[PDB]
């Protein structure tokens, strides 16, 4: 009767995605928003506490965001961090919010691999191109300068939420429903 | 742990032998009988610098039956192979890889031999790392200068161009040693002699 | 219909973080607060059980809960731990409530880091910051001082429930429903 | 209420086939699909984001492809790989759409041969096969030389998405449900 | 560690070197390279002590590594010296190839002993033509270890590619006719020393 | 591991108590048949049959017994030689502990009293496909067979019987196994005279 | 490990277990199992066949062990003609407690903080019943002789030690005298100590 | 081993160990488990041959063992027609503390830095209720021995000793002196003191 | 391992044990401790009067066993002169301060840490209480011996046991651990 | 139990003989255990020939920094001149360490590879405990890159942004970036 329940949660249009990006999470997510547009074109709003994680999953629900119609308010909450961040800047920096408390935390991806040496100039190149990309697609959905994003991701940059508002990330730190 | 027997050769000489290997190190024919890793190529170059100050003028032979190891012992017994004042041969026995071709190819031309049914396997090394972008991408780049050398090394040590080499190290471009020999890797197929004792 | 009874608990808005903090529970309780100011704006319950652990998950919820609409009482039993004590202070003093028997532990943020120096030099401004933004926090909730906090942090600070209401976390030590 | 929301989601004729190809999925898929096949004929719509996995069942769902009557719109969203995408590769060109941000990959099959020489000439006899027969599909599929395919495939051929549309994998990157 | 005996002959003497005082060689285990790295070495003392009295090398193994174990092999025939060959007990896929690895009339065993011919357990990882490679090589491995096999018997191939299909197990009587062993040591001759 | 001591009677160099027992020809089976033991005593039985292919033996068998195949060589090799060994049962033997001590040369087997005696079909394990495990069900039984059909000589029952009371492990003392005939006798006090 | 250190009256650099046999004493203070066993048997002989007169030593600090080795042990004692002067210092246990009254009579010995301990045979089994009677019907003649022989060497009654170690009958020595297990204590610090 | 250096002298050829050995010290700044007992007892009770008149200064940095194992040093540390000096450093416990307390009276002393665990013996106990309720008479009594001789030891009384043992005090070394554990703190060499 | 190379004839530890030198390594556990004792005493029969070295590379470790180490030098006469060389911690530097007045040496990159000892407890309460007590007698007894050993007052010490610290060699001298850093013939820095 | 040959000459192993030569293989792992070891052999050296010089072989990936500094201090200690020798890979304390010989022939194999890097480590604990944690550790990697910097006359920042990650060079660059003098073909270099 907990099927009754989430029909309540379901007409919040409200969204939690909490923890380690991984794929069996993003199932589930990807179940909640093709939901919400076969409802309706509505508002959605998220809130999001991540340490980041596997970034082909976050990579697709950057994009499933801008797939589809609905004009998607986002609160970063607590901490952020790469493969998580991307689906907060995947809502219009005129809808990315946050919490008055929130730290933000950017690295440039999650790398690992063992195998014969071409495996290596394989996947490397991947890899690189995958951060450029994501850097990119970071520094558009920010406003910043693509370099100044490539250069503090050598390490995990890490961002008071204040910060990351001056640094053009966040629209506002809401701090009530209000 | 398993046992090195003894032997009593020097004894009958008056001498006192001792065990085996090391009787086979005053002979100057030292044993690479095992996986190569760092603290054995320590002991082999130290058997090798320990030749330098013996007579390095009197040849070694050295024995290659490594199913092969890490990247860093075949630089070091290679380049002190340079450093060494005398020459070297190198015979495959058993089976020689990627680090253990390595060296026996990169022995005093016309004394890299080996054994008919020995194995000769090749191959670009092995390695990678994990973590961030850029620090892969730099051991991207370091792994690629060390196959880089390593096929143009044995581009040296054979004769055949960089390319074919490069593409026959795309895999485990396994030989035996009679296809070794022409593709130059050794010099000859070490098979017996009449002249001891007949 | 028994979940129509567990209903029942979103009748009265009595809520369970019981346990240790981490990200999964947050999607748990939070999956409850949304559910819950969507039905109205009343005093919420809270009943706080932790050791603690994942803060910054601790400290999502407490700007989750100032976020929404509603009020709150809260009811800190058996303990609470350094990353559960911000949900206590999420609360505001006069409405936060709390049980005799309890106990509190305000231990700075324990860490963890590893790698090159630099990189670990940078995990080292952030926790100092989490180690001062927490500090920020409940000296002001709790109207103390930076530096007095400070010093009891220093190390894991215990209060039984007393001198946390001579300390102010607590207003009042609720023993009874009445 | 929730069961008539998950019923909504097959109102949407969405699939989901997130994370390894297993013999775990196929059958929670393959039911999904033949759910999808006893309604009606209007396009199925699956989304990806897959690693990979053990190839040969993951076949059976490209053979399903096949076997049901819709249209099927397919969607690569964020990774594809070996196993998964032999079943977008499944679909005709003309329905398989994906996004801006997604890597495809393309590898040869993998095996874990053991034991007599004889039983390894076998069982690699087939792979070989298998790296035939999978080149096939694909080339035959992407309107693109067997050879081409097979050559590249040597080692981890990666591609971004355009590539993927110069190879003709792709027909559209869908990148808003417009 | 497994106990080792000493004797006094030339006194503190080990044991296994009075056996290769002899000239006899113990292979007592599996086949792995830092046995090889010191079965051959042991061989090349005797070559070079005398390569004229023959070798008498006392196999029981259950068959390591051809990797190794053709060293040996190659090894044997190299010396000027002829071994003979004696199975005490357990010869297995390697084993089976040092004992009729042996000089012709020189390969014996023990009568309830048992000897065992074998194809070649493999394995591979990885990609499908990194297996075909790694597969292929384990063909001729076992092509060429067949071909020694149908030598030293003078056995057509096929018929030891046949029955190296699976691991038979062969007594030395069933060897006898099928030449792995010249002979089979019940005594000395009834030479009473 | 236990430091075995020093026999200081040779004072030449005193050695260990193994290698005393080995110098007055006794041979201390003191573990489990196992390949890297039943060398040395392949190594310890062949140097001894050099030294005097007359005097005997004394194999001291303390076992439980272990890899059939190994003690088969050392089977063998005990019939080869001319020492004709003793085997002096202690402790206990086993599935093949017992089968060595049976294999002593005929009249010199013997075994302390209270000694424990485990007649035993074959340790067995087989794996495989079902035409591989076809084959080593042969080998074992070819095992069984041509084991069983000689420790019925070397006590010199039928075939039969002792297959059969060894169909499982049968525990019999030295006593109803001299009885048996496993042995010869059993020992009782020191050979000797005056103390 | 931490090394058997050397003796310095000592022809050469005994180790202390080969001193205490030029001494005929020999250290029982361990496990009793096979690897043991084949040291102390051959020990055993080994004094026998070197000076049958001078008594034998043989100390025990044993927890215990397995009961056939020490079966073997046994049979020796009675063998050799030797005087088996068997002491159990600190603890004797099923295997342990075994020898210390298997010792030669009025030749067994104990101090008065030993401790000691006699139960029946401790063992198990596993498989088919009848494989499981077998073992039962082992174990049994493994129990009855040990109560036997604790009942034959100590003159008690076979009938109490097989009711005695029924359980763990952990005594010191004195008690163990009043019950027969030994002949004395040898504590003593016998008057004149040149 | 890497652990002791092969010391030399010009004296002959030995171990750290020994050359002490050589010096009537005995060291046992380990564990008492059993197979070091064989060692300790062995060493002492050569000691006691060697020279029953030259004392032994046992050195001790333990964190204690074995009671079962412990007591037979005790008994033959009580046996040796030598006088012993026990000597505490670092650490004596449960068992260790035991000898230490155990010395000969006048005999018995202790670093002023060492510490000294008095604490009553622990038991492991499983099975069913009358092999535990066995095995706790035992145990029960070997607090009691080891309370009997501490109470005799130092001369102190025994429900005192059984109250301080209870929970287990860390007492250091003039804690000890005035206990009647030991005698005297050592301090530095004799003489011009230099 | 026989990687410990022999050098002459004897082993090389042996050796620097000859030269009137101990190589305390390895962490510090009681069997290596009682070896030290054991060579410590040694050394001082063969000359209770002649200076004796000592190098410490180690992590500390076992603070029981160390305080030995600290009995040890202040029983024998033997002035033992002290190096922290490499590395320095909880024990390890608590002997280098022990050492010989004014031969408590040090080489200029060395590090020496210093901080309340590290342990705990399992058991009922009034049990584990029992560990705190010893347990803070511990650095109660240790903090002022190496306060006095360096001469420093207690509560400053305490402040800088409080917490984990690291001092590098110049430091140490300025806090008074040591008193010198050797180098090139003992004295290019000192 | 593992292959070390004894010699011909006495009775000596392998690498012991090499000590008489003056030669030390440093063959492993910078941990306490073998800058025990080694650290002794050098001392020891330094006493048997104050003059004559002496040949530290270095073949390692490297290991504690703490360790690298009484290895540093102590050839820096002995009155003795070094010539220390790069093979294979000398990773981020071998690299380190090889400087530290004496300046003109700190050798080098050629196609040896050598590797700087940041003192690894790491810390798990409290605010101030991980912070204290990194105050040292950084104390250590400036003042390690403040001599590499010496010993190469590089420049300390220079030296820092190529510590900022793993740098791999060979001998040749790394001549040309000074961690070393010399580059050495058949003996010479070191003809005794």
């Known amino acids: 009767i907990t099927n009754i329940l989430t029909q309540k949660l379901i007409d919040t249009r409200t969204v939690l995605i909490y923890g380690e990006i991984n794929q069996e999470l993003a199932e ?5 928003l093709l939901l919400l547009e076969s409802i309706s074109n509505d508002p959605i709003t998220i809130f999001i506490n991540s340490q980041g994680g596997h970034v082909e999953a976050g990579d697709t629900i950057h994009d499933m965001i801008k797939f589809i119609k609905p004009t998607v308010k986002v609160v970063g909450t607590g901490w952020v961090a790469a493969a998580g961040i991307t689906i907060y800047l ?4 005129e809808n990315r919010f946050s919490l008055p408390n929130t730290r933000y935390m950017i690295h440039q991806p999650a790398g690992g691999v063992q195998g014969q040496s071409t495996e290596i100039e394989i996947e490397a190149k991947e890899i690189i191109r995958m951060r450029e990309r994501i850097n990119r697609l970071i520094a558009e959905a920010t406003g910043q300068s693509y370099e100044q994003i490539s250069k503090d991701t050598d390490r995990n940059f890490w961002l008071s939420v204040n910060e990351a508002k001056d640094y053009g ?4 730190i809401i701090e009530n429903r209000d | 742990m398993n046992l090195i027997p003894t032997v009593i050769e020097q004894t009958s000489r008056g001498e006192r032998a001792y065990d085996i290997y090391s009787r086979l190190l005053k002979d100057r024919i030292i044993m690479l009988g095992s996986a190569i890793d760092d603290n054995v190529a320590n002991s082999i170059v130290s058997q090798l610098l320990f030749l330098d100050a013996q007579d390095p003028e009197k040849d070694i032979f050295l024995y290659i039956n490594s199913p092969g190891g890490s990247i860093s012992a075949g630089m070091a017994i290679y380049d002190t192979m340079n450093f060494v004042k005398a020459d070297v041969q190198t015979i495959g026995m058993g089976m020689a890889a990627a680090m253990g071709s390595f060296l026996l190819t990169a022995g005093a031309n016309g004394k890299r031999f080996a054994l008919p049914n020995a194995e000769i396997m090749i191959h670009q090394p092995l390695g990678g790392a994990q973590g961030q972008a850029t620090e892969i991408e730099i051991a991207a780049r370091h792994i690629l200068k ?14 055949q161009p960089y390319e074919v080499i490069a593409r026959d190290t795309d895999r485990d471009n396994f030989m035996t040693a009679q296809e070794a020999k022409d593709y130059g890797l050794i010099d000859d197929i070490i098979i017996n002699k009449s002249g001891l004792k007949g």
């Open chain 1, 90 to 93: 995947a809502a219009e920096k």
């Open chain 1, 169 to 172: 990330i966040v629209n506002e």
């Open chain 2, 146 to 159: 060390i196959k880089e050398r390593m096929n143009t090394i044995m581009a040296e040590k054979t004769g």
């Open chain 1, 28 to 32: 589930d997510v990807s179940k909640q």
